[PDB]
Design a binder for these strands. Structure first.
Length: 756
DNA sequence: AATTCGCAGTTCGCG
DNA sequence: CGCGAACTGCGAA
């Protein structure tokens, strides 16, 4: 099993290192033969003698062009001829590529920005994370001494905790009477002891929660003060810290540093992303939080260090438990994309698709398009029409069926061969013509993207068949993860087409896809209304809710089945309308906001305040309780009673403040805000006392009595003291509870004042 | 750093 | 000095 690749430099030449885990044993394969290269396209071949002579400087060392070779590849499915330019060292290409491009005889250059080690995985057909290998895993966490107004890592680490399959332990340098605490005398001995534990356990994976941006940097700065060689790497090296523009990321060579924080943030939508919140969300059991002020107080008073140790022990143990949950999923993604678990677990959607496409393009001798420069990026910010959204017939409905397309956008890409290499390609026998926008797509041969999509959707079906017949539960679960990653990959091509930073950007493909989608969905609505008597209540992009007014449940279901038989004999290719479910009642609030209840009693809510992080729990919990009264019992008087009780509970100050918190994410540097909302105003108070407010930070505030602007009265919930602070019951009634229930109960005759 | 389509709370500036 | 626009955030698909 391949884990990662990198390269070192020996006597001026690059040496690829392949980190493997084969049959329980860690190994390093070296490859000294791979040469870095990019491609150039010339106005004329004789200019190759001119370009061969171009040189550059790499702080001191003079960079030349090692060797050139003419090659023939396809660019967008068309044959082209370029010059492959080899170099002795990978760091030669950034120092020289701009000089070769700026030549008047060089038209452009291609594949000039592929990192050497990832280039190696692609060119050599290697795939990380394949085969029967258990990785040994170890999670860890630190606890520090914090005082407000000090630099980063001015204060010592107090505890390093770790957990794996054999338990959890805490290393600390005061006496704590707990069986899982090991005591040493100094912070230096504690860090050294933790070095030894990692070197002794020799894990394949190190799991942190936000180690990319706190734990490793803290350890780095302490190890510098204390004079410690921080040698975590299997090759004896120190953690390698790398800037990914805004934040940081940390490699441990020979190991996989699995940081849960970017993984969880990309995988699940939660109101906050504290370790305690993530654990309760994934596992359903509470984790108590101990705050920095308590940790410092306990350390300097020496009182209640047991509580700090237990908190530290639990940090590692839930971090390990979350590692076990999410690592296999990310391993399959790494195996699917063809890049390291380290890389993919920190990659956006667009980067993931692109690395997939670069490997597939290599295997088909397709020269890759370039990322856009500034001129081209500007040109690319024209938008296009999206999915169809019917304005709903607002209110309460009985006996609803939801009908929709099985994978509308990938079905359109497959069926109509929507690809930039088929777009308006002249001289074919057969084309499909996108409605409204007019783009022609050749059908004589499968496009690059359509072919990959077809392969993907077919592999997913073989896996599902293989899961149902396989007898090995670990194989079945890995298979499950792989077909899930494939579904997500396949559903990413559409958005990638319209992504201006994409190498394979194609506004025409993307707007063709949505145009075909609007055609298919609206023709279907028209047919079910005019030929089958249905009333279509609401519809968004690829599906719609419908009923027969005044028909019983079993009529609606059967007439829907018949319509499906009718419409699917008219839908071309892979387009298929499916019976997704029957809902006994549904309430449609606005476009993109509704709730339905199925015959079993389960309620599904979309877009409503219930699903949002920036609404208080008391609002959400109250709206949810209203929706049960209506959907489940059809009981409007109960719904009104529920809201009357809640506004009174707030008015007499008996709602717990924990249900009053509002969560809003900071989305940028704070000086780039043109207008200061309440959450920006709280984040400015906090940042003015040394707390870091990078983008992605979730402000958790509560609104206090007094008045003026909401921002003048907002404080972090951590700062809320129920003996010097009174929350604004009028704000939570007039601006939170009633605004979420009013748009629903307006359908029965109630106004906000009948609800107080 | 996937897309467009959409709702709504806060704040501020203007007749 | 109420109101609309602007900014802002987070949803659906």
């Amino acid at each position: 099993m391949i884990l990662d690749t990198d390269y070192i430099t020996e006597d001026g030449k690059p040496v690829i290192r392949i980190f493997k885990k084969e049959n329980g044993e860690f190994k390093i394969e070296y490859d000294r033969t791979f040469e870095p290269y990019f491609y150039a396209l010339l106005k004329d071949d004789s200019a190759i003698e001119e370009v061969k002579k171009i040189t550059a400087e790499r702080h001191g060392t003079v960079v030349t062009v090692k060797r050139v070779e003419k090659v023939q590849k396809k660019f967008l499915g068309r044959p082209v001829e370029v010059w492959k330019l080899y170099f002795t060292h990978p760091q030669d290409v950034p120092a020289i590529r701009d000089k070769i491009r700026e030549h008047p005889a060089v038209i452009d250059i291609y594949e000039y920005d592929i990192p050497f080690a990832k280039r190696y995985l692609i060119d050599k057909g290697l795939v990380p994370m394949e085969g029967d290998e258990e990785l040994k895993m170890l999670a860890f966490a630190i606890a520090t001494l914090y005082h407000e107004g000090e630099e980063f890592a001015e204060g010592p680490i107090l505890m390093i905790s770790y957990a794996d399959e054999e338990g959890a332990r805490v290393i600390t340098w005061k006496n704590v009477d707990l069986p899982y605490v090991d005591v040493v005398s100094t912070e230096r001995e504690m860090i050294k002891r933790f070095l030894r534990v990692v070197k002794e356990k020799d894990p394949d994976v190190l799991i942190t929660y936000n180690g990319d941006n706190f734990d490793f940097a803290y350890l780095k700065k302490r190890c510098e003060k204390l004079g410690i060689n921080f040698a975590l790497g299997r090759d004896g090296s120190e953690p390698k810290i790398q800037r990914m523009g805004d934040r940081f990321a940390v490699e441990v060579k020979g190991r996989i540093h699995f940081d849960l924080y970017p993984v969880i943030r990309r995988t699940i939508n939660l109101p906050t992303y504290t370790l305690e919140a993530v654990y309760e969300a994934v596992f359903g059991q509470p984790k108590e939080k101990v705050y920095a002020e308590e940790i410092t107080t306990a350390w300097e008073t020496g009182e209640n260090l047991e509580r700090v140790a237990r908190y530290s022990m639990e940090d590692a143990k839930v971090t390990y438990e979350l590692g076990k949950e999410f690592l296999p999923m990310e391993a399959q993604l790494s195996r699917l994309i063809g890049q390291s678990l380290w890389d993919v677990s920190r990659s956006s959607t667009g980067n993931l698709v692109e690395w997939f496409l670069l490997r597939k393009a290599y295997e088909r001798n397709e020269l890759a398009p370039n990322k856009p420069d500034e001129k081209e990026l500007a040109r690319r910010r024209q938008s296009y029409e999206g999915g169809y959204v019917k304005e709903p017939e607002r209110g309460l409905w009985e006996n609803i069926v939801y009908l929709d397309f099985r994978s509308l956008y990938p079905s359109i890409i497959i069926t109509h061969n929507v690809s930039p290499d088929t777009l308006n390609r002249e001289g074919c026998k057969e084309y499909d013509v996108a409605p409204q926008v007019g783009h022609r797509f050749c059908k004589d041969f499968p496009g690059f993207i359509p072919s990959l999509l077809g392969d993907l959707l077919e592999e997913r079906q073989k896996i599902k068949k293989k899961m149902k017949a396989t007898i090995d539960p670990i194989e079945r679960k890995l298979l499950d993860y792989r077909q899930r990653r494939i579904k997500i990959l396949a559903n990413s091509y559409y958005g990638y087409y319209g992504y201006a930073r994409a190498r394979w950007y194609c506004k025409e493909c993307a707007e063709s896809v949505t145009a075909w989608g609007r055609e298919y969905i609206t023709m279907t609505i028209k047919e079910i209304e005019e030929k089958y008597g249905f009333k279509v209540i609401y519809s968004d992009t690829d599906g719609f809710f419908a009923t027969i007014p005044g028909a019983d449940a079993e009529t609606v279901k059967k007439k829907a089945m018949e319509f499906l038989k009718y419409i699917n004999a008219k839908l071309p290719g892979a387009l298929e309308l499916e019976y997704e479910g029957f809902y006994k009642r549904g309430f449609f609030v606005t476009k993109k906001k509704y709730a339905v209840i199925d015959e079993e009693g389960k309620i599904t809510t979309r877009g409503l305040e219930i699903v949002r992080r920036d609404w208080s729990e008391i609002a959400k919990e109250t709206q949810a309780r209203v929706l049960e009264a209506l959907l489940k019992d059809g009981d409007v008087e109960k719904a009104v009673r529920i809201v009357k009780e809640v506004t009174e509970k707030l008015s007499k100050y008996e709602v717990p403040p924990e249900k009053l918190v509002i969560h809003i994410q900071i989305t940028r540097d704070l000086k780039d805000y043109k207008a200061t909302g309440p959450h920006v105003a709280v984040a400015k108070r906090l940042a003015a006392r040394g707390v870091k407010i990078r983008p992605g930070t979730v402000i958790s505030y509560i609104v206090l009595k007094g008045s003026g602007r909401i921002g003048d009265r907002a404080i972090p919930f951590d700062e809320f003291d129920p003996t010097k602070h009174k929350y604004d019951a009028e704000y939570y009634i007039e601006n939170q509870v009633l605004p979420a229930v009013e748009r629903i109960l307006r359908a029965f005759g109630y106004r906000k004042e009948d609800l107080r």
